[PDB]
């Protein structure tokens, strides 16, 4: 297979990966989902004019002076009295403004004159200021108007978006589906983690690592187990993956390519990338029954598997789930140590760290405390060149965020 | 421009 | 209640919040968990000397020359032959090195001499180089040694840590428990999201927002519903929370404090914070049956609830689940617009954005594309002072990461 | 020093 450049490989993954269809879900399951419909309000917020303050709903045209308090409007109740000249109604923040009143005067701008004998009721109050019409009242529809679009299709939902659906009472929404991702490992040397060692064998760690990475991003997964490195077993496992899942990931193992090509008639878009690590990374698509499955065969080395998973698989999954720009976030950071550059673009897991009052983070390449912490970035080193053969501590480089 | 290849230290 | 400074409030939450006890879990459930035990390897990795390359396992003392190939060692099998003078054994990467061989010569450093008539077997090969002892062999225990501590207590686990547990076959581990968090809303004006509006009422959004925020961080939650703003109903709901959960969060609503103090005998550590928004935030602890419950009563305003939840609740939860430094990550960013400073420290949701080849991100305070994206930071504005009454676009400020 | 109060623009 020819050596594909990193840029060609990445663009190829994004271009060939489909966007999944849509489904209707309950709002509370919306975390990380992308809306496939515009969402409109069916009510005004607030639906009644509401007091912004504790105080009194007044007729501004009465001006300052001594008023009879005819009642109280409290949150959650509809007032039934009309405020007439020389009257006011006590209000609390959020309470509906009664008919007849056109402003609110906050309590600090008043002095109580008389209180019921028992002391439970305010009877008369002096209004010390001249209210302007509308003052301290949130009018109907100030925050949201009926028929307004409050969230657009393409919005990637978090907690506040869920709370907005709640506010407008839209509890069922159309969203893109999440990809189901099947993971298998291939290699005759592999045992399950639960197993004791046997001669010549080691425990499979890549399956757990990859499954955990995908789960961390919120996508459902299928564990396809360890698969013998031979055509028959590979074909059976791939067939199961294709049946159960939208995406299949393998690591290890050239029978894989032979099965994909000759047995499955998949399109293998690249089988080698000019990158370090991850040279042997393979990406294929399969069009079957009107839909497109995507298949990644990652290298068996566990650092390579982790790295290629973050570079190629995660952005594909983000596209599949409807995210409009599925590219990862890249930030600037300072190198923590010198690095000789390789002819290939090189990627290294690191821990981004922000120091007191220093504007750029440091990228620590994986003392006491750093070993307590999971990698949250991928240092992206440029390929070797005439001028640049080495980079030094303190120099600013790109780091892909993969974890903060 | 976006690039998935690291850039030289500006 | 007296006005507590932000710093005193934050330190108080962290100091008074307990660390939860421990439980044993399966490794695959380890995402985001903190190990409560050191983890030791029970085997060497690799457990046998392994070839780093495709090539031939040789006796370095034979030097270069023409060799008989006596067999092949492949991954997953224990070789049963001993390599003698003038012999070599074909090896693939990861295969065990057979007795008698002390180095590996990669295939590119050889030329095949004879192949079986059928062409399926290599019979003789010319070794073109002088191997050094140990060359291209990963020795037993190179990566991990038996009895080595591979993860320390206090490690906050991600995908690679899970994969490390898999590698060493430690499938059950002691971890700190996650806090169970109960959320309720109080307010006579509130209806469930599922409800049509009635006069004077609005839909409760804070419960969904807060529950989604807590769930986003991985903690189990209990929905305690809308609670009438009166002592009897508040006491019943708080009692249910205390029974079912480690942490209780309310928003809205002064009956709450009265119930906490007089009915529950909770310790209310502060009831007002000098901050904007979030002035009325209340934090209390209750020691009952030998354990400590924590209670937050957040303001009813939905921006305030979100903001105080991120500032005070999330760091408490991170402490409860065993994270050794539970403080949030604060980074430097550039203001996107001018801001007049308030006498209180002020917190505003924003979207952090990194621009092409610009080292510091911009903090966009919540065009087409920004409305598609959830807030991922909290701008932390300094209190007003003699010299500083305003900050301008481009100026560098602190932003708490709450979402990237 | 850590602080949960924003600092002045250095």
Curated annotation (Swiss-Prot), chains A, C:
Regulation of its activity: Inhibited by copper and tungsten.
Localisation per UniProt entry: Postsynaptic cell membrane; Cell membrane; Cytoplasm, Cytosol; Cytoplasm, Cytoskeleton
Keywords: ATP-binding, Cell membrane, Cell projection, Cytoplasm, Cytoskeleton, Lipoprotein, Magnesium, Membrane, Metal-binding, Molybdenum, Molybdenum cofactor biosynthesis, Multifunctional enzyme, Nucleotide-binding, Palmitate, Phosphoprotein, Postsynaptic cell membrane, Synapse, Transferase
Region named MPT adenylyltransferase: 1-404
EC number assigned by the record: 2.7.7.75, 2.10.1.1
PTMs per UniProt: Phosphorylated. Palmitoylated. Palmitoylation is stimulated by GABA type A receptors activity. Palmitoylation by ZDHHC12 regulates clustering at synapses.
An example Gene Ontology biological process: establishment of synaptic specificity at neuromuscular junction
Catalysed reaction equations from the record: molybdopterin + ATP + H(+) = adenylyl-molybdopterin + diphosphate; adenylyl-molybdopterin + molybdate = Mo-molybdopterin + AMP + H(+)
Pathway as given in its UniProt record: Cofactor biosynthesis; molybdopterin biosynthesis
Cofactor needs: Mg(2+)
Top-level class of the enzyme under EC nomenclature: transferase
Gene Ontology CC terms, in alphabetical order: cytoplasm; cytoplasmic side of plasma membrane; cytoskeleton; cytosol; dendrite; dendritic spine; GABA-ergic synapse; glycinergic synapse
Result after altering residue 10 to A: Reduced GLRB binding
Tissue expression pattern: Expressed in tissues including spinal cord, brain, liver, kidney and lung.
Mode of membrane association: Lipid-anchor
Signal peptide start and end residues: none
Quaternary structure annotation from Swiss-Prot or TrEMBL: Homotrimer, homodimer and homooligomer. Interacts with SRGAP2 (via SH3 domain). Interacts with GLRB. Interacts with GABARAP. Interacts with GABRA3. GABRA3 and GLRB occupy overlapping binding sites. Interacts with ARHGAP32; IQSEC3, INSYN1 and INSYN2A.
Function: Microtubule-associated protein involved in membrane protein-cytoskeleton interactions. It is thought to anchor the inhibitory glycine receptor (GLYR) to subsynaptic microtubules. Acts as a major instructive molecule at inhibitory synapses, where it also clusters GABA type A receptors.
Family statement drawn from the similarity comment of this UniProt entry: In the N-terminal section; belongs to the MoaB/Mog family.
Protein name: Gephyrin
Top-level taxonomy: Eukaryota, Metazoa, Chordata, Craniata, Vertebrata
From Swiss-Prot, chains B, D:
Tissue: Detected in spinal cord and brain stem (at protein level). Detected in spinal cord, cerebellum and brain cortex.
Location within or outside the cell: Postsynaptic cell membrane; Cell membrane; Synapse; Perikaryon
Superkingdom classification of source: Eukaryota
Oligomer status and interactors: Forms heteropentamers with glycin receptor alpha subunits. Heteropentamers with GLRA1 can be composed of two GLRA1 and three GLRB subunits, or three GLRA1 and two GLRB subunits, or four GLRA1 subunits and one GLRB subunit. Forms heteropentamers with GLRA2. Functional GLRB-GLRA2 heteropentamers contain four GLRA2 subunits and one GLRB subunit, although alternative subunit composition cannot be excluded. Forms a heteropentamer with GLRA3. Interacts with GPHN.
Family stated for the protein in its record: Belongs to the ligand-gated ion channel (TC 1.A.9) family. Glycine receptor (TC 1.A.9.3) subfamily. GLRB sub-subfamily.
Function text: Subunit of heteromeric glycine-gated chloride channels. Plays an important role in the down-regulation of neuronal excitability. Contributes to the generation of inhibitory postsynaptic currents.
Protein name: Glycine receptor subunit beta
Organism from which the protein derives: Rattus norvegicus
Phylogenetic classification of the source organism: Eukaryota, Metazoa, Chordata, Craniata, Vertebrata
Name of the coding gene: Glrb
